[PDB]
Subunit: 295 residues, 4 copies
Amino acid sequence: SAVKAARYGKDNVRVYKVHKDEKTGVQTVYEMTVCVLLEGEIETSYTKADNSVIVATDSIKNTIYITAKQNPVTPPELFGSILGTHFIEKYNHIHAAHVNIVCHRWTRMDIDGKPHPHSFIRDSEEKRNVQVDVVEGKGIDIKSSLSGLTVLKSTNSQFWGFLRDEYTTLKETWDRILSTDVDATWQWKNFSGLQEVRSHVPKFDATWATAREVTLKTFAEDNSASVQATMYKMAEQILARQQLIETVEYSLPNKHYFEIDLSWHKGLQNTGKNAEVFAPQSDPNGLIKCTVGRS
Amino acid sequence: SAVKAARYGKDNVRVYKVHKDEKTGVQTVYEMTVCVLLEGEIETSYTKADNSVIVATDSIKNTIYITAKQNPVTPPELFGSILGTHFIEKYNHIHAAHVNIVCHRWTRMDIDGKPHPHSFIRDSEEKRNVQVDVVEGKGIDIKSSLSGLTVLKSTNSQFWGFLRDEYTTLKETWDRILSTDVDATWQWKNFSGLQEVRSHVPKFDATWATAREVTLKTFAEDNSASVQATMYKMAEQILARQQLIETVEYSLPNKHYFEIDLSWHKGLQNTGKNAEVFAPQSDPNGLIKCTVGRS
Amino acid sequence: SAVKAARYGKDNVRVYKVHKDEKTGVQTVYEMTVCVLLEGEIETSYTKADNSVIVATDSIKNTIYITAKQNPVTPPELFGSILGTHFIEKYNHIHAAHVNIVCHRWTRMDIDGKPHPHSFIRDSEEKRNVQVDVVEGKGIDIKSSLSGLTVLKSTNSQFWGFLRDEYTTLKETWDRILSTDVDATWQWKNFSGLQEVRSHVPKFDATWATAREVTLKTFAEDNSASVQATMYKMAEQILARQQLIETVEYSLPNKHYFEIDLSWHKGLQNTGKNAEVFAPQSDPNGLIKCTVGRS
Amino acid sequence: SAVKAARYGKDNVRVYKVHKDEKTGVQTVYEMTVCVLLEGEIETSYTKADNSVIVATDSIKNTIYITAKQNPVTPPELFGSILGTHFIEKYNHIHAAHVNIVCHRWTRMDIDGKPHPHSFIRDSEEKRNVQVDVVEGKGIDIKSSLSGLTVLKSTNSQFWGFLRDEYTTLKETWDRILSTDVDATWQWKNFSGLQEVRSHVPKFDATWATAREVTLKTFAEDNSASVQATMYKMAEQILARQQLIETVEYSLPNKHYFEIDLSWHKGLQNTGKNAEVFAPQSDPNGLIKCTVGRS
Ligand SMILES: O=c1[nH]c(=O)c2nn[nH]c2[nH]1
Ligand SMILES: O=c1[nH]c(=O)c2nn[nH]c2[nH]1
Ligand SMILES: O=c1[nH]c(=O)c2nn[nH]c2[nH]1
Ligand SMILES: O=c1[nH]c(=O)c2nn[nH]c2[nH]1
Ligand SMILES: [Kr]
Ligand SMILES: [Kr]
Ligand SMILES: [Kr]
Ligand SMILES: [Kr]
Ligand SMILES: [Kr]
Ligand SMILES: [Kr]
Ligand SMILES: [Kr]
Ligand SMILES: [Kr]
Ligand code: NA
Ligand code: NA
Ligand code: NA
Ligand code: NA
């Protein structure tokens, strides 16, 4: 046999960091979950019980904490790039570092209409994520995303004109509920190394803000022909707004809300124009995916 | 043997309702998960295979949908009271209905600074709940709550002066992180029936808003001596603000954030005044509970 | 205001223990999750920032580990009794200790038909639990349970003869699927203290084994008239087999499996006697509860 | 912009099927969760609101049920191949079908030492899965796996000889706990179509049984130098036992169990040879991955 691929490291590393402005008293918090997996000249750890090539996962954990103490943890694209660059530079035999970061929301509280200096709320389970692949001699590949952004519109969604054959029961509709959990990813141009990442730092927060704003506005305003058509509009607008993005990917469940025919009970009218009460369906769910790039 | 207690019904009934103002075009959505369990002269269904006393759980489900079509679903205290009253009035042999409702957030989106007429975001996993126990001849007992309200403050929490003996390792602290998931319950005066509930309807939304506001402000502003001391302040203020509440209950995890001593690595200082990077602990967690009533 | 009830402590304490027979080489493992909440003369911690009455939750955690090192962790009824007795004896002002234990399965592997001395499998997510309430001057109240025991029978379940009115759509059936997650609790006679618990130690494992055996056999063999009727048979048999049990409680979801009418497609027959393919329903679910005691 | 990749379909389709031997009375059950995502000449559904190219996800759901009624659902590799072949054959413009199946355990109960004809237990949360990619003109690519197989050994695991530098705190050990959740995947030789899959049908159940047996025996018997070394032994043995497998992949968390130093309390000895009570760590966790192929 032989090792065809191998990577290893530490997953599920929870990290908090606080910044304290000792002049204003304003504190700012950051919380993430980090995974770092390494690749390199490590096959003998698998084939010959050769632990000498292993940077222990415990040491990778220590390194995450140390790196967070010594550097900014925001934007996550930068932190992940710093962290991944450390492992390929420090260890000659390590040739790739794959850094995944999930950023958790801690939004400053407003108390009596004033932002509080040191109190925060988890205002959504929505995450901001990065995948940063630092590959020796091949630069830094970053995928940024938002996920867990759960939305619903109560009208201005349609679905008609689809293929109809002997497997089809679905009725056409000109007015339905549309709800999803948005998972949106933007793939950056390859960066040559950490200097190039640092040169673009403001673009990371700005492009996440653009992606989120476009997602929400297009969802709210598009009189949707399908999930497919609406998500494509989101992607095209994000590409138009940031030239350093190569592709935008969406992965969207269609979280169905079924009408409930109540006409069997006292002639109650609860379908079509009279539909008020619906049954949210936990499963199954449509799942619609697109990757959009330039033409 | 004999049946000492019995209740049965339908759990996990997902319900959506929309309101459409056909004059303004503004739509408003409501989503909940409902459980209804009944009690009464039902023991023979258990002891003698006598299904004649069973209102089928499927029929209880149907009834939840029908009741949502025929009545307001807000405030949940009212909906639950309507629903529970239906079962004890409709069925002579049913003597109690226990209605639990979890309300899911669908907050109207603001698009370009204007509230959108029909688009919503799940802006938090925080729930608003009710437990409505409708007991024939004994009125309606309501417990209202908020849950899943996750908060953190980065300073202005202390914990010193606790008992120290041979089981104690914990260091006293005058400056720590405090984070919790708030579960706060207010117990209403017994209501004699549905008329009395309806007579107090505006108090339900107002008291939930008070409970939430007091929770957030007291958490943010109290230089906390302990979870115990802070939560008591919340409860006392809520009781002072609504005379129709008899008790307030809090159940709070202390979601610990541990300092990380990095002095083994290059003398890095990350404890005490220099603490910036922390390890959030998933488990174990302190769990602190109080029920507060009038003196 | 005043404190009407209060309890506090440490939840979600994960504990492993190994026993090593250094003569045979056979190792045996135990894994649990423990919660200990204390009550007593603690109100001033809530009302006056008086931490002197607080046995820190961190110290409660330490105590759980220490107690596991110094005593058997099995049966859980005994461990919980030891642990709870410690807090009310050690601390004059602590008057109750509420100990919850969830026991996780680690079943010894059989390798080439021989039990392995030190390798284990999590052979089910089924738990064995205890709730041990140690109350100074009032002894030790134990509730034992099994939970998460998920079963299905493909026939020999019926449901007919239930109440039919204008809310009813459910068809009677003489042959359906029945599936549930068993939560079964047996409540012991009050014990006067730890000596009395210890005097009954073999009964704990024997009664858990009886409860499990009766559950499985009655589920498998009863041509069920309803969940209600079948669960009552389980409870009555357990009471008949252990006189030191006062009550048995079951809480059972009816995890519905719906027929799928396929007659719209090529006349396919998939209902009634021809039903082969079903749609498991995630929600809603019936929920049926009984507490059975002696007559 | 332009569509670079697109796939869509129905996820989370729960399916049960029963087989009834009407001669012996023995019933056998199967339960799965299915996802089917299609690719093909579908870009205009995204770019031009052209729903004519969409086989509705609802219709894909119907098709899963119909296919389960008309064909065996076991082995899952065969069912998935049938299902995926249907979509690329039925629809000229659909060129790939990606079928994921998770198989849930329903193990026949033994009652009084005899297998019961129609009662089953979910004896583990362990899954058997397939990923079947049916690509028009490119055959059928199958990845089979087992997942959620949770194991622990209490000794005969070591970890020493790893890289030690200024980031390292981990102590070498010659005797530790090892616990993981096994995710093991075997990748089949490409099949030309459904006939070739059918020609190998017995190999699917046999190779899953081999993979599971080798996993358990190697875990139990290897005096492990590392997760890396042990998992490689598993993979090499599986490749040696089935020539129609090209690669074996393992993904293994190292679910850490930490010693607890209790020497601060009464000199209690709970480390090294005296270690009995451990703290299972929920997070972080090592994560170790290998893909092994022939040399
Ligand atoms: O927007 C939708 N897209 C689809 O592909 C689909 N299929 N059924 N319903 C659907 N809704
Ligand atoms: O606020 C707190 N309350 C307690 O009871 C406690 N125990 N350890 N830490 C604690 N923090
Ligand atoms: O066993 C059952 N019990 C019930 O109470 C019920 N109601 N609907 N179906 C049911 N099945
Ligand atoms: O088996 C192990 N492999 C590793 O790579 C490792 N790192 N820390 N501990 C470890 N244990
Ligand atoms: Kr962080
Ligand atoms: Kr969308
Ligand atoms: Kr609702
Ligand atoms: Kr608090
Ligand atoms: Kr244990
Ligand atoms: Kr049952
Ligand atoms: Kr199935
Ligand atoms: Kr392993
Ligand atoms: Na390198
Ligand atoms: Na009644
Ligand atoms: Na005491
Ligand atoms: Na085709």
